[PDB]
Amino acid sequence: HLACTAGIFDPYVPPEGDARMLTQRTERLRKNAASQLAIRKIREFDANFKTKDFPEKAKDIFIEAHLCLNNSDHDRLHTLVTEHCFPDMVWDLKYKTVRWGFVESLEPAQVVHVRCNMYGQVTVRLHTRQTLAIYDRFGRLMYGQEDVPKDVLEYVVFERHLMNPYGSWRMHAKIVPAWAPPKQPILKTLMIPGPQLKPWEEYE
Amino acid sequence: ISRKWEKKNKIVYPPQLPGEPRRPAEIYHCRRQIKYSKDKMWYLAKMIRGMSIDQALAQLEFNDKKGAQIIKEVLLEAQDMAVRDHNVEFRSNLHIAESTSGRGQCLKRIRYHGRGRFGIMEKVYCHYFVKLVEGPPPPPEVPKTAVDHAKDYIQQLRSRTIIHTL
Amino acid sequence: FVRLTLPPPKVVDRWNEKRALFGVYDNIGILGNFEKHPKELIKGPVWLRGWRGNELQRCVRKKKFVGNRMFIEDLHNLNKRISYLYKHFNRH
Amino acid sequence: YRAPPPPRRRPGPHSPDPENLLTPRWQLTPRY
Amino acid sequence: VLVCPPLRSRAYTPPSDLQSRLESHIKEVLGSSLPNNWQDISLDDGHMKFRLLAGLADGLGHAVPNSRLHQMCRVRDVLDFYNVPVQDKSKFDELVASNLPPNLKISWSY
Amino acid sequence: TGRGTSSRFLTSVLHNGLGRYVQQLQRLSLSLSRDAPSSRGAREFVEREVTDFARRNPGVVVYVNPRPCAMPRIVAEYLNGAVREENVNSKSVEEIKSLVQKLAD
Amino acid sequence: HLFCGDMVEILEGKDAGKQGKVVQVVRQRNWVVLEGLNTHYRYIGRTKDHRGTMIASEAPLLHHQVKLVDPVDRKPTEIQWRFTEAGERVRVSTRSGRIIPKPEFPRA
RNA sequence: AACUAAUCCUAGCCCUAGCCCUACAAAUAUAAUUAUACUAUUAUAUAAAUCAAAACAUUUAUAAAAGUAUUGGAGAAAGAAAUUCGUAAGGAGCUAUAGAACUAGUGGAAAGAUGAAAGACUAAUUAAAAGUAAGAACAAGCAAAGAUUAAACCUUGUACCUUUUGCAUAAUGAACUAACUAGAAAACUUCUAACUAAAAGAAUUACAGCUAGAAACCCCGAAACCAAAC
């Protein structure tokens, strides 16, 4: 049984400068021609799905899922996110302790684009300041700052199984806009090994 | 069979506080099944105790015993995971804190003899245990000088207490 | 060496029908006008109902009671066991 | 619980079946 | 359709007007209305004993024990038997209401 | 045994008797079971002698906690922090009283 | 009384109280499998190169952990086996007696 | 926190009760299992001895009356009838060195252990035996004891079991760890009670007896002897 499908039905293209940006909401009003028919399909199974109010529900799941990481609440996070999302979140956090906190959101979350036997994926736009600090098995700090807020803008895709009676909205994937700044680098320094050659061969 | 050496590598310490020195890394690696005598392997372990990672590797490369080659392979595996999984920045910054060998489960057979005699044949197996601490090997011990020896003797004389008296 | 695991918890009911009704009619003879002797209420091997004896006596009585219904193998074994028992008690 | 009915010996004459092999001979004699 | 009445305590204290209830019981139970030397009257009569003891038990609230039943030959025994107090208070209950000192702590975990 | 056992020198806690004597024992705890033959002797002790000891020594905290218990136990705590436990299983009133007096001293 | 395709309510388990359709029945262990219910998440394709892909895998449910559902009223009604006019055995609810027709299951 | 190891409960059994029983093809007694001719085709005398009689010889068991009488190297022991009387699934058993030898007749063994789910990455749990490692040793001595500020020094002290004389500087036996491994019967007495010139739920004893209860006597090991097979 699969309650989620990897990938996005149609990839929404974020416009550069959207962080600076009513306005964008009207752009959705202009673009509901592409998306309203999709919105109707979610509405048909639910009838209470509105692009205006979904971000509030979507935001809680996103924040709640991040909180589970600190407590390693795998069972709780399992419900919040889809099967595809869960392994990525926690696989690289094995044998690590992370302190994550959510600072006030810079801008309100808004639905951006939705698509849809039937799996509905809703893109949500979120800019929020957060604090991240990850330590080693020995407790040594390896990445992030304990109490430094980092402002990050990303687009988060939630998914639900419309056909299933118990289907619910669970975080599936995140769309990263190209104009977003690169993530902070690791504290430690890495070494790139040189080319490997056989005894007969010579360096090139 | 007990495999508590591996569990020592699965230990996760609590997050270190700001007012705490950076914890040195400790790695526990072992090979459970080796077709070699523990007693013979122990000699190799004893010599390498306390030496640096590079110094031990160099000696192993020029060692004639079969166990030494196995030890070098075991050492290389531990070093690789240490950087890959134990967040070791420098490959050279490793030294042999502990090295020892243990008995392993053997196989039993009957040893025939050409003159009608028989014997108990045993196929020996052993375990090899090593713990590696990140950092250079500790400085070697310095023999006590005559001044140090005399001071202790005088201190002992002063420390003497009267026995069995009011 | 000793167990490293706990045994299953056990609770015993002392007022079950078997225990509750245990001993009833033990006074059948005195309270029943002696029409039925309490020995008549003994349940067990036929050759020792209402009768007691030493191990040799019990085996001998068993042989007589069910000798016609005993297996040849059992009968042969009983005879051999009886012979050893007879010598020990009657000579040592 | 309620105690079971008291055991009772069957009264009255009882005639063994002569044809039955199991019935002991002494129970079929005129003295019987 | 049968409902149990509330359980009744076995604690009995001699009434202040003990004789009043006693004599009234005899005055009613006994036709002679408490005759001379009532204390020394015998209770061997079955009918009189049942009426007197039952009436006293209901009115007073204390009943003669079956083990002590035969001892009630004379009214003197009945009068003496009733006048002795009976308390249901447990030993722990008595200890609780015994001016517990500050350094002594009691807690009933049952 | 002396070689295999520890020893100490004569000493006093803090010169207790120089100015005024202070009782080291600070707390006594008694556990009892309402229905247990082992506690019968302890059961009677509470009725008769527990009060007298409390009056004689009012500076010791006394705890009496009847509870379902397999074996009654007495716990004595001292000012210095020493704690000693004595089982009262199937012990008479006289035995209990003697032990308490020794503990106080 | 449980057959593949039967709508049943999970008396106890991870998804207790969620009605599902049977898809596999291991009668030897009295196990009933409901698709999309009592479904845990596990890694498929775990290999040296890749960690693996999370998938939802159903877990067995014992027979006592499920009960049949009356079509008109969705409840875990106890059923009793009785024949029909055609002679085919049909489970009948002990209370609110009704015929639960045998479900249609696609060929494996 | 280590190694070697250890950990577990059902694999199953035992005794009574109940119950008698009447549970593919192809090839085969030739050379059994060789699809058709050979070549006729066929068990079994008292059971004895061993054993007991401390050897050995006649001899030696295999409901009440009653262990009375007789018999018997009168000894180890053997022992009627008359005459009365006679309807009718469980375990103060065992649980992988225990219980059947057994998971198995594979003369005759050895052994297995996660969880509800492995279509949840196969489980944990234990300073736990001896043996080792972590951590070689430091004048002096049955290895400890009294001690001591102090591990060793100073002081005191002729390993153990059994057996010899109530003595070993004799002599036997012991590499060590775990499990297994040797006293069993009531005729009479004392004691505990019931009832009493009577006692006992039939068969017994009685001039205080009679009835019930309680109280007891090992293990391993020959050279041998005989029967029946091979």
Swiss-Prot record, chain A:
Keywords: Mitochondrion, Ribonucleoprotein, Ribosomal protein, Transit peptide. GO terms for molecular function: structural constituent of ribosome. It is found in: Mitochondrion. One of its GO terms (biological process) is mitochondrial translation. Transmembrane segments: none annotated. Its main location: mitochondrion. GO terms for cellular component: mitochondrial inner membrane; mitochondrial large ribosomal subunit; mitochondrion. It comes from the Eukaryota. Component of the mitochondrial ribosome large subunit (39S) which comprises a 16S rRNA and about 50 distinct proteins. Belongs to the mitochondrion-specific ribosomal protein mL45 family. Component of the mitochondrial large ribosomal subunit (mt-LSU). Within the mitochondrial ribosomes, required to direct the nascent polypeptide toward the tunnel exit and position the exit at a distance from the membrane surface. This is Large ribosomal subunit protein mL45.
Swiss-Prot record, chain B:
It comes from the Eukaryota. Its main location: mitochondrion. The keyword Transcription does not apply. The chain holds residues 41 to 206 of 206 of the full protein. This is Large ribosomal subunit protein uL22m. It is found in: Mitochondrion. Component of the mitochondrial ribosome large subunit (39S) which comprises a 16S rRNA and about 50 distinct proteins. It comes from Mus musculus. Belongs to the universal ribosomal protein uL22 family. GO terms for molecular function: structural constituent of ribosome. Keywords: Mitochondrion, Ribonucleoprotein, Ribosomal protein, Transit peptide. GO terms for cellular component: mitochondrial inner membrane; mitochondrial large ribosomal subunit; mitochondrion. GO terms for biological process: mitochondrial translation. The keyword Ribosomal protein applies.
Swiss-Prot record, chain C:
Its main location: mitochondrion. One of its GO terms (molecular function) is structural constituent of ribosome. The keyword Cell membrane does not apply. One of its GO terms (cellular component) is mitochondrial inner membrane. It is found in: Mitochondrion. Keywords: Mitochondrion, Ribonucleoprotein, Ribosomal protein, Transit peptide. The keyword Ribonucleoprotein applies. One of its GO terms (biological process) is mitochondrial translation. Belongs to the mitochondrion-specific ribosomal protein mL51 family. This is Large ribosomal subunit protein mL51. The lineage of its organism: Eukaryota, Metazoa, Chordata, Craniata, Vertebrata. The chain holds residues 33 to 124 of 128 of the full protein.
Curated annotation (Swiss-Prot), chain D:
It is found in: Mitochondrion; Nucleus. Residues 1-23 are annotated as: Disordered. Belongs to the mitochondrion-specific ribosomal protein mL64 family. Component of the mitochondrial ribosome large subunit (39S) which comprises a 16S rRNA and about 50 distinct proteins. Interacts with GADD45A, GADD45B and GADD45G. Interacts with NR4A1 via the NR4A1 AB domain. Interacts with ATAD3A and ATAD3B. Acts as a negative regulator of G1 to S cell cycle phase progression by inhibiting cyclin-dependent kinases. Inhibitory effects are additive with GADD45 proteins but also occur in the absence of GADD45 proteins. Acts as a repressor of the orphan nuclear receptor NR4A1 by inhibiting AB domain-mediated transcriptional activity. May be involved in the hormone-mediated regulation of NR4A1 transcriptional activity. May play a role in mitochondrial protein synthesis. This is Large ribosomal subunit protein mL64. It comes from Mus musculus. The lineage of its organism: Eukaryota, Metazoa, Chordata, Craniata, Vertebrata. The gene is Gadd45gip1. The chain holds residues 25 to 56 of 222 of the full protein.
